[PDB]
Symmetry: C2
Subunit: 94 residues, 2 copies
Amino acid sequence: SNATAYIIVGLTPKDAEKLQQYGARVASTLAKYSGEVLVKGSVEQLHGKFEHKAQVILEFPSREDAYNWYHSEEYQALISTRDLGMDSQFQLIG
Amino acid sequence: SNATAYIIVGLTPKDAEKLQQYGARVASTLAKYSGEVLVKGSVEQLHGKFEHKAQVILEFPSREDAYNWYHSEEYQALISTRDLGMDSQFQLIG
């Protein structure tokens, strides 16, 4: 009944150590915007092409809350190290 | 809990009428495998690059059903018309 919003990530691991620093710190950043990991996992290609190894999907209670999470100061501090840990794409939907 | 599985499509519309036809047929193919559309929508890009205009996420009760759906007889017939209506990528997480 509400307009649930989603962030889709498409990713490829680079630096393992850095990727684990990133992953460790993020979950906290989500709970202020009521973020939640719907699924994560490796890709099996069913059609077309896709440049990435794995996908993660975040779920928020509202588009505005998804956008605000990505743009929060607590998440943004995570970014320089996220990019060392993985090349990715993020898409906001909703 | 069970291991709910997902199909993520990223798409770019081509022929609106071929597309209409596709869209109008897929659903009946979903029910067979307990498929459900989690979400449909245009993309605002948060980070990095993404070739498509829009994403759709499909939710199935398992990876078996998700794969069986895509490779099902009745969905496979919809493909020819699908590919005329849109360029797309289908990823299987599950």
